Amino acid sequence: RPNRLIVDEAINEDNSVVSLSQPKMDELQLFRGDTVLLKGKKRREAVCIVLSDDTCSDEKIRMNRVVRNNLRVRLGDVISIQPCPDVKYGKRIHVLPIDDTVEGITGNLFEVYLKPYFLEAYRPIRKGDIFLVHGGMRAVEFKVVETDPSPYCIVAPDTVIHCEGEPIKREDEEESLNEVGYDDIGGCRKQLAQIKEMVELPLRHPALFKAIGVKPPRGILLYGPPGTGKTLIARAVANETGAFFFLI
Amino acid sequence: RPNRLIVDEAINEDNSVVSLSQPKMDELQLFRGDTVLLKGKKRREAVCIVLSDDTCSDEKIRMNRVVRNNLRVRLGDVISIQPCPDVKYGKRIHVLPIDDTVEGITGNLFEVYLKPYFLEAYRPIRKGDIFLVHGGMRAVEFKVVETDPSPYCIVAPDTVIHCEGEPIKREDEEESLNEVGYDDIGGCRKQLAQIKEMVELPLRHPALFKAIGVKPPRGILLYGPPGTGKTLIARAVANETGAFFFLINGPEIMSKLAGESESNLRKAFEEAEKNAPAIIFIDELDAIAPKREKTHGEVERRIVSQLLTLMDGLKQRAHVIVMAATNRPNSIDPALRRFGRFDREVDIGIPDATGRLEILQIHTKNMKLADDVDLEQVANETHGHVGADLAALCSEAALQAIRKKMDLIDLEDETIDAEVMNSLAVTMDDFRWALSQSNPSALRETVVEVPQVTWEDIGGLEDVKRELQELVQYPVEHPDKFLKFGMTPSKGVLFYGPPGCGKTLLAKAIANECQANFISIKGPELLTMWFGESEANVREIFDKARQAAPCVLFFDELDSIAKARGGNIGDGGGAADRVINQILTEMDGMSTKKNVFIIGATNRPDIIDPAILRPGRLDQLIYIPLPDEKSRVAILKANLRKSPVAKDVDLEFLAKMTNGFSGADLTEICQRACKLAIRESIESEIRRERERQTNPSEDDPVPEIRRDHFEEAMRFARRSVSDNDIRKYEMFAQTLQQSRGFGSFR
Ligand SMILES: C[C@@H]1CN(C(=O)Cn2ncc(-c3cc(F)c(OCc4nnc(SC5CCCCC5)n4-c4cccnc4)cc3F)n2)C[C@H](C)O1
Ligand SMILES: Nc1ncnc2c1ncn2[C@@H]1O[C@H](COP(=O)(O)OP(=O)(O)O)[C@@H](O)[C@H]1O
Ligand SMILES: Nc1ncnc2c1ncn2[C@@H]1O[C@H](COP(=O)(O)OP(=O)(O)O)[C@@H](O)[C@H]1O
Ligand SMILES: Nc1ncnc2c1ncn2[C@@H]1O[C@H](COP(=O)(O)OP(=O)(O)O)[C@@H](O)[C@H]1O
Structure with a gap:
């Protein structure tokens, strides 16, 4: 059943790509780069782009933190897909930057950190979508407010993208959970995978641990030379799983 | 007189079996599997099943904690038996789970954790009976409320067992004393037996110790590597004997205000004393009372004296026993090693090779382990693992089984409990991983x-x-x-x-x-x-x-x-x-x-x-x-x-x-022969895989160490002793030997 799949960490990213397996994409009815129309959890969907790599195993779907945070999905969750290989263009795409990411940088953000991403990168353009572009020495992110096609659109120069205005505040009702995550952890992939397999279930699934009975690790003693990322990996495995992180 | 017998620990269990001796069962009028109609202490009886093993000695009767707690009997007590080899079937057996054992697991408990026990296991079915079934990764227990035959019934498919309802609360009037006990202690059977013979009389029989005169051990200094079960065995010998267990683990007291922590320890001892059979267990006694001269000051010694004046201040006529847990007590204060305070210092030690097997068996009770897993290879390979490491390996295997089935477990909104928990079936392939991903605690x-x-x-x-x-x-x-x-x-x-x-x-x-x-x-x-x-x-x-x-x-x-x-x-x-x-x-x-x-x-x-x-x-x-x-x-x-x-x-x-x-x-030489044989076998196996992969698409090229393998290994042999070296040993032996056969005259 290609409708539902369990999410996983992506490696290609591109701020937009969702990776499947061709032996599985055939069941998903996507071949080369067709639109995915990713279905989220609460009340949103993303167009996304289909691609493949080695780590699929025909079992899991991979999405970078841009999509995961856009769809309100934490790594390790289960989501749905609504494949639709169709092309439809928009004309009133309007975008505004996020104050949490623009709070002292001022300029032609339509040109300075936007040109190399609004075409040929296939941004998950859809009303309410939030995407990071990684511009000039800061992870500047934007939100596309209006997209007159939906939930999918062609990201191409034929589609019209309009200039932005003053920055808007981030949604504190959800906080967007930007912080950090697995995508900005490098050099300890094996250790991060060990911590993930060690801590994901008790944090994501506290319900079963009151019934399953077996005790999970009450505490995990990360250690290493100073500045190795212990705090970084702890905060990543906290935010990435949605667990509240209390630094003492 | 077969009417009355003294209870003892059972080893076969089965949640139902009561073990006697055939040379004694003949006096008991039971032969193969006849009903026992076990008689309890207060107002209850159990049907039970008769069986035999080695440890009977024609003197004692053995019952697992299921029966003992069901009959309100503590290990070491004296009970009665009412033999009746008769068969009578019931039709309105109704059972309900115990909330203390079901408080978050929901499902068809009549099918998920009941089918493999209500027939051919001979549950002690009788109105008011409580029995543990050990289902899906939790020691779920049930109580049979109504049994229209009594006090004995046939546990067979002819008898009708009905579906349960909402869970019921455990009887706080008696508390059922589930906790832990001797049955879940493994790898230290000798040490547990020593503690039992050391502590059973003063706790079970405080009355005689006011008349016997001889002082029992005021305190017992359990010790061993951390996670060896010191707390577990202390709590078992406490609950199993009915003694109140007061845990005053060191850090819980050393963390309180100086002077106020002294009062806390003193009032803990007063709590132990106010009830006669209670025992107080001091966990992590190293923190409380390390070497006197190595302490800094204030609390680290204020407690120790405050402990000493209370350790021996007790008159021993209050029937209070102060057990302690430490690590190689050479570290604790030597003053506590004196007699009248800590006169017996049993050493639990790490479980041995065959003890880890029992530890795994007791810990892998509810996991519903698959058939391909043996638990004896795991025990042998877990050399140096302490019982805590065995529990950690158990939990890791369970978590991996969950995590290799999260794909088909999170179908609904995460876990719905349900029967699915039985499907885990932790095979060897998961144990292997857990064992390889766990560091022995005590390997040195x-x-x-x-x-x-x-x-x-x-x-x-x-x-x-x-x-x-x-x-x-x-x-x-x-x-x-x-x-x-x-x-x-x-x-x-x-x-x-x-x-x-x-x-x-x-x-x-x-x-x-x-x-x-x-x-x-x-x-x-x-x-x-x-x-x-x-x-x-x-x-x-x-x-x-x-x-x-x-x-x-x-x-x-x-x-x-x-x-x-x-x-x-x-x-x-x-x-x-x-x-x-x-x-x-x-x-x-x-x-x-x-x-x-x-x-x-x-x-x-x-x-x-x-x-x-x-x-x-x-x-x-x-x-x-x-x-x-x-x-x-x-x-x-x-x-x-x-x-x-x-x-x-x-x-x-x-x-x-x-x-x-x-x-x-x-x-x-033998190892080289086996090494060459295994090399040949693996080479043939990979060649067979090559044949499988290629177009053609006899399974035992070398099913034993062959003779030419021994030939080649002997050709590869080596000797480590020369003529002079071997002669040196006999020449040395001549130093304490003689050839004085001349003195043949007697
Ligand atoms: C003043 C002295 C004495 N004297 C006497 O007239 C009195 N006298 N005569 C004999 C004994 C005696 C002493 C023992 F120490 C003893 O120990 C038995 C034992 N118990 N368990 C084990 S363990 C064993 C080995 C390892 C674990 C697995 C099993 N062993 C054991 C085994 C092998 C060797 N040694 C002890 C038994 C005895 F009979 N006293 C006069 C003389 C001139 O000088
Ligand atoms: N494995 C890593 N991946 C990415 N950044 C790292 C890593 N380890 C350290 N850093 C960087 O070093 C800084 C300190 O991180 P961390 O070691 O987690 O905190 P601390 O140095 O206080 O232990 C961070 O700003 C982080 O960007
Ligand atoms: N001999 C043993 N038999 C069964 N379980 C044990 C044993 N030793 C340790 N354990 C397990 O290790 C854990 C810690 O037990 P214990 O050593 O008594 O407490 P502590 O580790 O605080 O000293 C328990 O959960 C217990 O299940
Ligand atoms: N019947 C036997 N007689 C002598 N050695 C044996 C016998 N069976 C096995 N061995 C081997 O002898 C070895 C024991 O060596 P050992 O004599 O203890 O060394 P050391 O003399 O240095 O203490 C083991 O590795 C074992 O494989």
Whole structure:
């Protein structure tokens, strides 16, 4: 059943790509780069782009933190897909930057950190979508407010993208959970995978641990030379799983 | 009189079985499986099933904690029996789960954790009965409310069992005393038995101890590596005997305000005293009372004195017992080691090879382990793992099984409990991972164990199997004769011979025969002490042997200290040295311990200082020669045993061709043969995989170690002893030997 799949960490990213397996994409009815129309959890969907790599195993779907945070999905969750290989263009795409990411940088953000991403990168353009572009020495992110096609659109120069205005505040009702995550952890992939397999279930699934009975690790003693990322990996495995992180 | 009997621990369990002895069941009027109609203490009876095993002794009746708690009986009590070999069936058996055991698991409990127990298991079905079934990863228990036959019924599909409803609350009026007990303690059966015989009477029978006069142990100092079960065994011997258990774990008190923590400890002792049978358990006593002179000040000593004045302040007529947990109590305050406060200091120690099997069995009760898993390979491979490590491995395997099934477990909104939990089936493939991903807690501690190398394994040497069986088994089996002729049994034996000739194997076999612990301090450990300028550590090792049961403290590869510095010649110093001298000094203390049988092993005896090989110390020299023809045949057969071998090989020819090879290098020849055989087998296996992958798309190219493999291994053999080296041992033997056959005149 290609409708539902369990999410996983992506490696290609591109701020937009969702990776499947061709032996599985055939069941998903996507071949080369067709639109995915990713279905989220609460009340949103993303167009996304289909691609493949080695780590699929025909079992899991991979999405970078841009999509995961856009769809309100934490790594390790289960989501749905609504494949639709169709092309439809928009004309009133309007975008505004996020104050949490623009709070002292001022300029032609339509040109300075936007040109190399609004075409040929296939941004998950859809009303309410939030995407990071990684511009000039800061992870500047934007939100596309209006997209007159939906939930999918062609990201191409034929589609019209309009200039932005003053920055808007981030949604504190959800906080967007930007912080950090697995995508900005490098050099300890094996250790991060060990911590993930060690801590994901008790944090994501506290319900079963009151019934399953077996005790999970009450505490995990990360250690290493100073500045190795212990705090970084702890905060990543906290935010990435949605667990509240209390630094003492 | 078969009516009344004293209860005891059961080993077969089955949640229902009550074990008697057939020579006693004949008096009980039960033969094969007849109903027992067990009679309890207050107002209840159980049907139970009769069976037998070894430990009955025609004196005691054995019941698992399910029956004991069902009948309101504590282990060590006296109960009655009302035999009635009759069959009567019921039709309105209704059961409900206990909320204390079901508080978050929801599903078809009539099917998920009930089917494999309501028939052919013979549950103690009777109105008011409570039974544990051990279902899906939790010790779920149920209570049968109504049983229209009573007090006995047939547990068979003819009898009708009905579906349950919402869970019911546990009876707080009695609390059911589930907690833990002896049945979930494994790997320290001897130590648990010692604690039971030490503590059962004062707790169960406080009445006599106000009249008996003799003081029981006011405090018991349990100790061992962390996670060994000290708290678990303390809580088991508390609950199992009905004694109130008060845990005052060190940090919980040391964390409170100075002076106020003293009051907290004092009022904890007052709480223990206000009720007579209570026992107070001091966990992590190292923190509370470390070495006095090593404490800094204020609390670290304010508590200790406050502890001491309370440790011995109790009059022992209040029936309060102060158990304690520590790690190698050489670290705790010596003042607490005095008598009247801590007079008994049993050593739990890490579980041995066959104890980890029992620990896994008890911990892997609810996991619903698959059939392909054995739990004996896991126990053997988990060398050095403490019981806590075994529990961690258990939990890791369970978590991996969940995590390899999260794909089909999170179908609904995460977990819905449900029957799905039975599907886990933790196969070996998950244990392997957990074992490989767990670090032994105590891998650098001298392990006390009963080795499982029997006399059969050590073939060949025979005069030494009877010249060594004598010294060990005669002064224990018939000590009366030895105290008649006046000789004191020789508590010392050193084996001198060619290197690698079974000295360790012979010592381990001696330990195995008389069910004795075997502490081997190999040569490298003695070198660690000698180089480290820490010969005082030797005092610990001997003590480690003293606190144990009959123990062949075995100084494997003795003289390594002297071998590491040339020896009696070639070095400025003499034969004596730090570690050997300390061993000599401490050995004289254990010359009157009458349970320890200090053994030595030396690959080069002539360098050993003769101060140790004189009466009292390792006086009795024993020579194990390099194996002879028949002995080499026996060694070959014994060390190729437990491994496939073809009929083509004839070990007699190999043995005779094996002209001058010791035991170690002969087993090396066998290992090389097996290594080449496994290489051939794996090469053939990968070639067969090649054939499978290619177009063509007989399964046993080499199902045993073949003969030409032995040929090639022997061609690859190597000998470690030369003519001069082997002659040196006999020349040394001449020092304490003679050929004075001239004095034939009686
Ligand atoms: C003043 C003295 C004495 N004297 C006497 O007239 C009185 N007298 N005569 C004999 C004994 C005697 C002493 C013992 F120490 C003893 O110990 C038995 C024992 N129990 N368990 C084990 S462990 C064994 C080995 C390892 C674990 C697995 C099983 N052993 C054991 C085994 C092997 C060797 N040694 C002890 C038994 C005895 F009979 N006292 C006069 C004399 C001139 O000098
Ligand atoms: N494995 C890593 N991946 C990415 N950044 C790292 C890593 N380890 C350290 N850093 C960087 O070093 C800084 C300190 O991180 P961390 O070691 O987690 O905190 P601390 O240095 O206080 O232990 C961070 O700003 C982080 O960007
Ligand atoms: N001999 C044993 N038998 C069964 N379980 C044990 C044993 N030793 C340790 N454990 C397990 O290890 C854990 C810790 O037990 P224990 O050592 O009594 O407490 P602590 O580790 O605080 O000293 C328990 O959950 C228990 O299940
Ligand atoms: N019947 C036997 N006789 C002698 N050695 C054997 C016998 N069976 C096996 N062995 C091998 O002998 C070795 C024991 O060597 P050991 O004599 O303890 O060395 P050392 O003499 O240095 O203490 C083991 O590795 C074992 O494989």
